[PDB]
């Protein structure tokens, strides 16, 4: 076995070689005279494609290693790229990887037809939002050269950006003495922007991952206007939504498929071993009393509240060290010491029994939080945290080879990243760094802060340190890096999260009166005149907006309207009382909710017309009228089906959700014990502008103090912080959602003890507190989430005898019948036409390569269309205009050579006369032009680009050749339906919530999320943020300006405002406001995948 000895040490002193990822040079070289020593022997002896590989690799390292003069750092790159040998050696990643290389062979389906569509959004963009990236608020000239005193512009308020602008109606506006003009750079470093199908098409890859999409909402709506909304409506719901559900579906059965294929002391100790059940019960109730006070401390406690939890947990520890003792000398250390449990809780209270002796306060803050791993011990009753133990286990057991991979795909990717870019990150850092620091806080020039860009990557944001890496060093392999980290590891995640879904979880004259008022209630008339009053009181609430005191007719004209449609609803409710019958009406479950709508607006109406409209709790039922448009979901029946199936899912959502509050509480407390009271700094509040004051005149409170000569210096705190287990649980909702968590880590890893500023990055490993957070509180709790929604799915399916939900009888019908127009296979050709004449376009017209030239023509126009740009010149946009003729010209030719051939027979297939639109279009596009140009009336520019919209319709014919695409394309518009019912639902929960912001959140000071054009003064500016927050996306920007509740932000004393008496939002309201609504809409969102995912396995 000496050769297996050689062998086995030559591999690990290999692997340990690469290990050694850390900056010093001191011993290197001498690696080298082992790599020729084992290099020798191995031919000598003389007793796979990757083995081919790996000879090669021994002999380029040993040409890489003979004259060193000069070192590009390359060469490092072949020997890391030698650590794979040992994802050989384990016996488990083979067959793992082989698994991996078969999911992405399925996935190229998908592949294609997400390129094409990002490739036809790219071409849109590009057409509508060319140059609008360019656009800046301008100084005017007081007063004459081709370039004047440059262009000095105005810093959008808190931040450091230009000012966007627009000449549009609902565009966005410079102050007094700024003017809208075209610049010739773009926002970020000038990489984001439409002015070519490139960037295009990076702007629309950023879409569909939804990385930062936000920002270019933004942009684009401040450069274009508000009406371009309609824009991301689509992107994000056919981008994002749909083909992250096709890869997520694909991953499903290409997994799935390959695990289907496969004296004294005895009487004392004998007392001591039987145990009455009555013991562990009064374990149990410790247990909670003892999380219960851990979850009580804070920043501002009292000395005598400090003491009671010491008390208290000195009482608690060595309680439990009584039971362990009693249960040592109950059973034998031998039997006692076998018990999976047992021994955990030994550790755990040993562990506490050397704090006790090692007590400083703020020693081992962590370990102090080791006490709270007690409450796994509650799993024994608890089901459903056992099956989470049970997650968290096979996450290193059945499936250890997935999470091994993941960490050497993780650990590669970041030692590569620090070799090729490092340097480049320290000697130009002075780019990227922030206005008033000195380094990013994200780079390359360490393993650690490259494994967290890594991480971050992994966690879905990745273009911004692209941009910055992209600034600090050479483009290439910043694309090369960044995408290729992007794909493997979302693709490696997501397997991850499937494999362990799957095998987890899966393995007289009254009643004569009476009659007759029956008969009207039940009347169809009657039912639509109610609809149609709800669908009016409705829509009379978007118009109690921030400028309805401006407009004083149509206020009153409000009144009289309300006042009549709650008299209506009286009388309804009266009719529905003297039909139904009283019994019946109050067990309903619907007429519940109408009585008490129409109770809340006859409480308001009374107290209204009585002088007790002021008064708060009257005050705070006016704001309840929102509730209105609820009486909607009774009425419409796909709503109604809605409801059900979530009602019908409401129970196991909550047991779950118990489970994660008890694990977020645990988070929460270690959070409280790190950080609280830490976050506060002193911030240089001067004109909507803050910053950080140097560590060279304070590192106090006190001092801040002092230094307060010009009346700036304000001592505040971080507005998402950890000093409360409450507040906690607003950070951590903060970092899993992955918003608004870079302000929190940026304050944790900055921080010091209390009552001090803080110092850059004087805490940089709290940031595995974050690691170590997402990691188990945020993905195995999602897929605990997701395992029992879809189990309760399955469950809800089987009961109603295995059929779909969300789908009215009518859609089902629909269901079927469109079920029927996808599988009718056969067509029996046409007849061949007599003449000779109108025969000869027939035969020639019909044979494939008529269609494959004409498919050959459609790809030529695209990429003609593709290289437009903007300014670009007069002589390129002739040329391409002649072509876009030549072009029209050919396929109007097509048409009128079909339609002569085929006589009748042409418009009964419909994609002739799809084809026939489109040519239509075209022609219509193409007239329309030259009429509408400068000869005749000169609209705004902007029409001209949404009229060249027509020549999209040729690319899309080219769905026709795809067959995998028309049948992914199928599956959609099967699914649509249900869809259908499930966007109604949401739209009126998000109309709900419009009115509730335009009513509580109004008058907020313009911030971070919150300006002229997205804030809550308007219908459809409280809609574009609730789009914008029904991804998630920037929901930390908008709740931001509302936690504010005083000076330096806020002004709680404004004479002109009527609310707050200031801009001062209302934390409380704001809290729930927002909290509730990501939930709301996750959980539906959750509702609407499964909806897709479930049609596909049937389409396959
Ligand atoms: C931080 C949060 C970490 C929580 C880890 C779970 C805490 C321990 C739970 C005890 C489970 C147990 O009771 O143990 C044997 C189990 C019980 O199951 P039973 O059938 O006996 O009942 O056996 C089984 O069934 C399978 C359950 C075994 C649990 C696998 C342990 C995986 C933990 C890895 C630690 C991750 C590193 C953390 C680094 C952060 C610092
Ligand atoms: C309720 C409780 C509150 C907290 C829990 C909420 C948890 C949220 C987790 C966020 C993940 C959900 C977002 C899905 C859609 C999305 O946001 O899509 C991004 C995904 C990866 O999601 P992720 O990075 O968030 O993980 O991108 C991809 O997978 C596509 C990968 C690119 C492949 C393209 C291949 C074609 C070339
Ligand atoms: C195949 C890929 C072909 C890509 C297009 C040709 C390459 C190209 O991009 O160069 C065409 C020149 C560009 O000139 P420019 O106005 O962009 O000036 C430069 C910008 N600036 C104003 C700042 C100085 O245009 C010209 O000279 C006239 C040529 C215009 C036709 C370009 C190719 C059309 C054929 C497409 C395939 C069928
Ligand atoms: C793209 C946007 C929207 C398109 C949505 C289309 C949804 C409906 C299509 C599916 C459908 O329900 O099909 C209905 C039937 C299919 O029967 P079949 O002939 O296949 O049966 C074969 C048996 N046999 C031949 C003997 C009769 O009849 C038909 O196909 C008639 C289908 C006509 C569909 C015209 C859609 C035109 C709408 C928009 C065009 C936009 C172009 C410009 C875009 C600018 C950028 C935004
Ligand atoms: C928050 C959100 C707000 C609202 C957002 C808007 C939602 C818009 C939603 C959907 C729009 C597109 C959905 C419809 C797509 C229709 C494609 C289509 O219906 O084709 C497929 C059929 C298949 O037939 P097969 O024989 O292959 O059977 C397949 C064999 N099996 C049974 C195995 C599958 O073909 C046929 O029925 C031939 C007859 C139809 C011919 C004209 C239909 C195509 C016209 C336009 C399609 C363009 C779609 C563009 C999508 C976006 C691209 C960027
Ligand atoms: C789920 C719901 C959990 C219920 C949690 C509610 C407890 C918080 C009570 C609260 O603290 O409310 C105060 C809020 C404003 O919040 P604040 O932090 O300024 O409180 C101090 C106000 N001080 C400085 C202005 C005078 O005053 C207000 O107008 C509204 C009062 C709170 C509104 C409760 C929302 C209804 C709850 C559930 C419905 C779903
Ligand atoms: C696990 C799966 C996801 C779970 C997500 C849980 C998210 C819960 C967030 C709860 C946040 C509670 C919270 O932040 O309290 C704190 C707020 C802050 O108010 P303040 O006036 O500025 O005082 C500040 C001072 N530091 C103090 O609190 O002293 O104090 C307040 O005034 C707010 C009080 C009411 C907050 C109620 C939140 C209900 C959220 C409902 C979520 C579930 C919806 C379904
Ligand atoms: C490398 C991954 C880059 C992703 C982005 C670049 O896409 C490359 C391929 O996915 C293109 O399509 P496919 O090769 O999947 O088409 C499959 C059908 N044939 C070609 C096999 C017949
Ligand atoms: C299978 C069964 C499992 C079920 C478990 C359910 C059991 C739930 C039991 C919950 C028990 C609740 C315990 C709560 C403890 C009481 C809550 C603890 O109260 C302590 C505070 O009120 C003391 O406040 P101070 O008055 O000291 O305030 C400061 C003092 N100065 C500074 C003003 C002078
Ligand atoms: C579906 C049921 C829920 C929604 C019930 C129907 O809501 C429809 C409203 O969105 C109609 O638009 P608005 O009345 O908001 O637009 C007018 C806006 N300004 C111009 C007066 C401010
Ligand atoms: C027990 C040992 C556990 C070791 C790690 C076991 C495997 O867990 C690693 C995954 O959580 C890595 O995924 P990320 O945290 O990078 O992705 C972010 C989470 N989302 C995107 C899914 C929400
Ligand atoms: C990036 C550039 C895009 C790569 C473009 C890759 O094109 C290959 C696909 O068309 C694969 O299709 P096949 O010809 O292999 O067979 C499939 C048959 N149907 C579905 C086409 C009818
Ligand atoms: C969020 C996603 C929004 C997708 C929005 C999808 O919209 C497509 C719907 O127009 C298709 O609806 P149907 O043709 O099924 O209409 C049948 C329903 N009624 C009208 C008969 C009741
Ligand atoms: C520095 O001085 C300024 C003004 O002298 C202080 O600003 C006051 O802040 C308090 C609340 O902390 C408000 O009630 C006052 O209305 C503010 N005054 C003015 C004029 O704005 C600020 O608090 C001081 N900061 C520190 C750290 O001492
Ligand atoms: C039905 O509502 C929709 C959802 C989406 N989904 C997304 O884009 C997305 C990504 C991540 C999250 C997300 C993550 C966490 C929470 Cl708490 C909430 C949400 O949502 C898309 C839609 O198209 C209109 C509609």
């Known amino acids: 076995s000496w050769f297996s000895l050689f062998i086995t040490v030559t591999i690990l002193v290999n692997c340990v070689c690469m290990t050694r990822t850390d900056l010093p040079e001191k011993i290197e070289y001498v690696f080298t005279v082992i790599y020729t020593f084992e290099a020798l022997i191995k031919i000598l002896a003389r007793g796979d494609p990757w083995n081919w590989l790996d000879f090669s690799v021994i002999t380029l390292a040993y040409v890489g290693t003979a004259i060193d003069l000069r070192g590009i750092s390359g060469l490092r790159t072949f020997r890391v790229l030698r650590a794979l040998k040992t994802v050989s050696v384990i016996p488990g990643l083979k067959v793992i990887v082989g698994a991996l290389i078969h999911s992405v062979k399925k996935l190229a389906d998908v592949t294609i037809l997400t390129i094409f569509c990002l490739s036809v959004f790219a071409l849109v963009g590009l057409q509508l939002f060319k140059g609008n990236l360019k656009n800046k608020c301008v100084k005017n000239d007081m007063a004459y050269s081709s370039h004047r005193k440059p262009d000095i512009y105005i810093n959008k308020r808190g931040t450091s950006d230009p000012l966007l602008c627009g000449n549009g109606s609902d565009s966005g506006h410079c102050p007094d003495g700024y003017i809208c003009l075209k610049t010739s750079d773009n926002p970020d470093f000038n990489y984001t922007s439409f002015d070519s199908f490139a960037w295009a098409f990076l702007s629309l890859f950023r879409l569909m991952t939804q990385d930062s999409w936000e920002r270019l909402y933004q942009q684009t709506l401040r450069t274009s206007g508000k009406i371009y909304m309609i824009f991301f409506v689509l992107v994000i719901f056919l981008g994002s939504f749909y083909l992250v559900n096709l890869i997520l579906a694909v991953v499903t059965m290409a997994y799935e498929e390959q695990n289907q294929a496969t004296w004294v002391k005895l009487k004392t100790i004998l007392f001591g071993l039987v145990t009455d059940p009555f013991a562990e019960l009064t374990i149990t109730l410790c247990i909670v009393v003892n999380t219960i006070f851990m979850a009580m401390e804070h920043h501002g406690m009292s000395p005598t509240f400090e003491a009671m939890l010491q008390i208290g947990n000195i009482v608690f520890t060595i309680f439990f060290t009584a039971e362990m003792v009693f249960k040592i000398i109950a059973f034998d250390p031998y039997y006692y010491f ?381 507005k998402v912080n950890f000093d409360n287990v409450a507040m906690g649980y607003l950070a951590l909702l903060q970092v899993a959602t992955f918003k608004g968590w870079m302000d929190i880590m940026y304050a944790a890893v900055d921080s010091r003890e209390v009552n001090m500023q803080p110092k850059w990055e004087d805490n940089v490993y709290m940031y595995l507190y974050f690691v170590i957070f997402i990691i188990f509180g945020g993905f195995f709790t999602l897929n605990l989430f997701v395992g029992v929604i879809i189990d309760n799915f399955n469950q809800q399916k089987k009961k109603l005898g295995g059929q779909d939900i969300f789908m009215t009888e009518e859609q089902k019908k629909y269901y079927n019948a469109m079920k029927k127009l996808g599988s009718k296979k056969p067509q029996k050709p046409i007849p061949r036409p007599l003449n000779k004449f109108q025969g000869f376009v027939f035969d020639i017209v019909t044979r494939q390569a008529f269609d494959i030239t004409i498919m050959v023509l459609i790809c030529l126009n695209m990429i003609t269309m593709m290289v437009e740009t903007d300014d670009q010149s007069e002589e390129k946009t002739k040329i391409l205009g002649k072509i876009n003729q030549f072009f029209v010209a050919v396929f109007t030719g097509e048409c009128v050579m079909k339609m002569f051939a085929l006589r009748q027979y042409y418009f009964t297939n419909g994609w002739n006369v799809f084809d026939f639109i489109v040519v239509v279009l075209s022609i219509a596009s193409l007239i329309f032009s030259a009429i509408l140009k400068s000869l005749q009336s000169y609209f705004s520019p902007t029409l001209f680009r949404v009229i060249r919209l027509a020549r999209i319709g040729r690319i899309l014919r080219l769905i026709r050749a795809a067959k995998g695409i028309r049948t992914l394309l199928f599956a959609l518009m099967m699914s649509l339906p249900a869809l259908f019912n499930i966007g109604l639902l949401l739209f009126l929960v998000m109309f709900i919530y419009s009115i509730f912001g335009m009513s509580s959140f109004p008058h907020v000071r313009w911030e971070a999320g919150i300006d002229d054009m997205f804030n809550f003064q308007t219908f459809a500016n409280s809609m574009l943020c609730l789009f914008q927050i029904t991804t998630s996306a920037g929901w930390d920007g908008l709740l931001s300006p509302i936690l504010n509740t005083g000076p330096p932000y806020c002004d709680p004393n404004l004479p002109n405002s009527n609310g707050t008496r200031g801009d001062c939002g209302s934390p409380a309201v704001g809290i729930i406001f927002f909290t509730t609504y990501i939930i709301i809409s996750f959980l539906i969102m959750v509702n609407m995948y499964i909806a897709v995912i479930l049609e596909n396995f049937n389409v396959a």
């Not at 992209?470 to 590891?489: A, D, H, N, R, Y």
């Not at 709503?639 to 129970?651: C, F, H, N």
């Open 338 to 718: 076998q018990k999976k449990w047992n021994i955990f809780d030994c550790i755990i209270v040993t562990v506490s029994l050397l704090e006790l002796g090692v007590a400083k306060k703020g020693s081992l803050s962590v370990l102090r939080s080791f006490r709270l791993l007690r409450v796994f011990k509650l799993a024994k009753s608890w089901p459903t945290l056992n099956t989470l133990i049970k997650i968290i286990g096979n996450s290193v057991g059945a499936l250890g080879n997935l999470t091994i991979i993941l960490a050497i795909i993780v650990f590669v990717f970041a030692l590569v990243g620090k070799q090729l870019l490092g340097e480049n990150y320290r000697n130009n850092r002075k780019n990227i760094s922030a206005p008033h620091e000195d380094w990013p806080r994200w780079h390359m020039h360490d393993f650690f802060h490259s494994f967290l860009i890594v991480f971050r990557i992994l966690c879905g944001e990745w273009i911004e340190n692209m941009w910055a890496c992209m600034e600090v060093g050479q483009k290439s392999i910043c694309l090369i890096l960044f995408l290729t980290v992007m794909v493997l590891g979302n693709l490696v995640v997501l397997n991850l999260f499937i494999a362990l879904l799957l095998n987890s979880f899966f393995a007289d004259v009254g009643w004569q009166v009476r009659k007759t008022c029956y008969r009207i209630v039940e009347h169809s008339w009657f039912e639509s005149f109610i609809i149609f009053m709800i669908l009016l009181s409705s829509g009379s609430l978007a118009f109690e907006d921030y400028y309805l005191d401006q407009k004083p007719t149509v206020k009153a004209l409000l009144e009289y309207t309300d006042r009549v449609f709650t008299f209506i609803f009286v009388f309804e409710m009266l009719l529905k009382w003297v039909a139904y019958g009283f019994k019946k009406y109050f067990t309903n479950a619907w007429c519940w909710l109408d009585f008490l709508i129409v109770n809340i607006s006859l409480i308001s109406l009374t107290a209204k017309i009585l002088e007790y409209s002021e008064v708060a709790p009257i005050k705070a039922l006016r704001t309840l009228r929102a509730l209105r448009p609820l009486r909607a979901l009774s009425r419409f029946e796909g709503m109604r089906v809605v409801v059900d199936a979530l009602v019908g899912a409401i129970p196991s959502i909550m047991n779950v959700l118990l489970v994660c509050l008890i694990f977020w509480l645990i988070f929460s407390i270690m959070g409280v014990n790190l950080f609280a009271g830490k976050f506060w700094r002193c911030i240089n509040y001067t004109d909507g502008e803050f910053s950080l004051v140097p560590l060279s005149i304070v590192n106090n409170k006190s001092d801040c103090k002092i230094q307060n000569s010009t009346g700036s210096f304000f001592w505040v705190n971080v």
